[PDB]
Amino acid sequence: EALLGVYTNVVEFVKFLETALAAACVNTEFKDLRRMIDGKIQFKISMPT
Amino acid sequence: EALLGVYTNVVEFVKFLETALAAACVNTEFKDLRRMIDGKIQFKISMPT
């Protein structure tokens, strides 16, 4: 006698680009980030008098 | 490791003649101000009775 069961699905959630939190961050898809050691940003601020 | 951004300030000049502070003044260009010793403006006020 073959028996069947009832399974309920995993409740899916709104993705990251579809929330309003991404208005605070700038999103890029860096494909190979496990190869990166460091990443730097360099500012150069000239100051008037 | 990676360079991700190389950023720098640019100081935009603000001319005196395009501030609204110059509304309270009268601006005349005077080519040779080093020649002048002293300026002078003379008033004549008549008073009726």
Q: Does B7 touch chain A (CB under 8 A)?
A: yes
Q: Which two tokens stand for residue A20?
A: 């309003």
Torsion, Cα of B3, A33, A37, A46 (10° steps): 20
Q: Which two tokens stand for residue A40?
A: 């730097």
Contact across the interface for B8 and A44, Cβ inside 8 Å: yes
Q: What is the resolution of this structure in A?
A: 3.7
Please name the residues in contact with B4: beta carbons below 8 A apart, sequence gap of 6 or more.
A39, A40, A41
Q: Which two tokens stand for residue A8?
A: 């309920």
Work out the minimum CA distance from A12 to partner chain B, whole angstroms: 34
Method: cryo-EM
B8: which strand partners? A44
Closest C-alpha to A40, from B18, B3, B7, B48: B3
Contact across the interface for A45 and B8, Cβ inside 8 Å: yes
Contact across the interface for A46 and B4, Cβ inside 8 Å: no
Q: Name residue, tokens 């990443």.
A: A39
